[PDB]
């Protein structure tokens, strides 16, 4: 039974770790309100430190689900509305094209072609980021094409923080992580916890821990353990267990605004019908989905992302590859954290084998 679950997770993980040369991988599963942890290999190859459920990994774009939760809190406090013009929350943007762009457009990558990343010319500097947004002009009409963009959801989180009158990083550390009960979740890893921070590995096992970048906190800033990220998944599965404004914050991340192919776009979370084929879930998490613009099919009203659906988010940095998925209607949650950036198709392959086997 524990033997069966170990066999299922081992069968899904071991070949993918071997095929993708992944030094270390942490799995956490929430099954009928019980946590299960499976830890593989090395957090650091050089000093032989083993992965545990307390090992910290970079989760990259999975950070956007925390950014969406902070925005959900600002929405619950009536400090902002998704149909607000972006420039409402930052006077520096008054007179810019952000006068004509909604917070919802920023959150769902439909602002009109904000790029995948800030150009190399924009450094982690308040004035450079300000001047970048002031000069930016859309390629196409806001609300028409999805282009996955760090500057887009970055500005969404930055503006959500301005609506609450405090810096983004302060709000996350002082309000969001404590409200969610997350003590092993960091934007800036304390010196005392550095022993838990896994090494990331790239080409020729070059060591890679994420360096500073513009709106890094909002887009890809979070370092967390498999155990902490599963607590976050369990909060998402049962928002009603939190104090009401935080319950409302998490619910705001479970609302679908439009479809691209099989995927329904929420704030942070991306949803699929469940069941669905592995090939379809791989295609929804494919490189073209990340790198190319897609015409959206807008929903007449926002859809509740609950019941027979899989909510998921991939996230990467140069050295790390994360995947989180949950099935609201089955009280099933999954976290897969690795210290190599391995293909999304392979992350989805592990998840699919586990989620299929638990069913």
Candidates 285, 258, 268; CA nearest to 349 is 285
Radius of gyration over every alpha carbon of the chain, rounded to an integer in angstroms: 19
Question: What is the C-alpha separation between 56 and 40, in angstroms, rounded?
Answer: 14
Question: Which residues does 120 contact at the CB level (< 8 Å), separation at least 6?
Answer: none
- What are 336's strand-pairing partners? 27, 323
Peptide bond into 32 cis (omega under 30): no
Domains of the chain, by residue range, sit at 1-359
C-beta separation of 269 from 253 below 8 A: yes
Q: Just list the catalytic residues.
A: 61, 148
How many CB atoms lie under 10 A from the CB of residue 194? 9
- What are 36's strand-pairing partners? 29
Candidates 276, 301, 283; CA nearest to 352 is 276
- Note the resolution in Å, 1 decimal: 1.8
Question: What is the C-alpha separation between 134 and 128, in angstroms, rounded?
Answer: 10
């Amino acid at each position: 039974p524990a033997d069966r679950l170990k066999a299922l997770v081992d069968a899904a993980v071991q070949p993918v770790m071997k095929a993708n040369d992944i030094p270390g991988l942490a799995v956490a599963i929430s099954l009928k309100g019980e946590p299960h942890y499976f830890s593989y290999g090395l957090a650091s190859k050089e000093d032989g430190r083993r992965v545990t459920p307390e090992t910290l990994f970079e989760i990259g774009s999975v950070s956007k689900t925390f950014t969406a939760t902070l925005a959900g809190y600002a929405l619950a406090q009536d400090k902002m509305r998704l149909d607000d013009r972006a420039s409402q929350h930052w006077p520096a943007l008054q007179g810019s094209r952000f006068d004509g762009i909604s917070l919802l457009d920023l959150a769902t990558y439909t602002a009109g072609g904000l790029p995948l990343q800030f150009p190399d010319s924009v450094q982690k500097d308040q004035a450079q980021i300000r001047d970048y947004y002031r000069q930016w002009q859309p390629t196409y009409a806001p609300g028409s094409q999805r282009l996955y963009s760090n500057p887009s959801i970055g500005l969404f989180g930055y503006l959500a923080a301005r609506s609450l009158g405090q810096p983004f990083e302060r709000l996350m550390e002082q309000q969001v992580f404590p409200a969610l009960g997350l003590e092993q979740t960091h934007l800036d890893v304390p010196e005392a916890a550095l022993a838990q921070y896994a090494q990331g590995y790239g080409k020729d096992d070059r060591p890679l821990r994420v360096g500073p970048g513009p709106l890094d906190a909002e887009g890809y800033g979070v370092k967390t353990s498999a155990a902490d990220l599963l607590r976050f998944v369990d909060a998402n599965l049962h928002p009603e267990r939190l104090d009401r404004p935080w319950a409302q914050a998490l619910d705001a991340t479970h609302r679908g605004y439009y479809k691209v192919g099989d995927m329904t776009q929420g704030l942070g979370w991306e949803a699929y019908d469940w069941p669905i084929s592995l090939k379809r879930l791989q295609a929804g998490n494919s490189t073209p989905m990340a790198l190319q613009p897609h015409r959206i099919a807008r929903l007449p009203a926002p859809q509740a992302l609950e019941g027979q659906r899989l909510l998921n988010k991939t996230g990467s940095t140069n050295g790390f590859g994360a995947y989180v998925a949950f099935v609201p209607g089955r009280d099933l949650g999954l976290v897969i954290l690795a210290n190599r950036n391995y293909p999304n198709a392979e992350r989805v392959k592990i998840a699919y084998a586990i989620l299929s086997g638990l069913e």
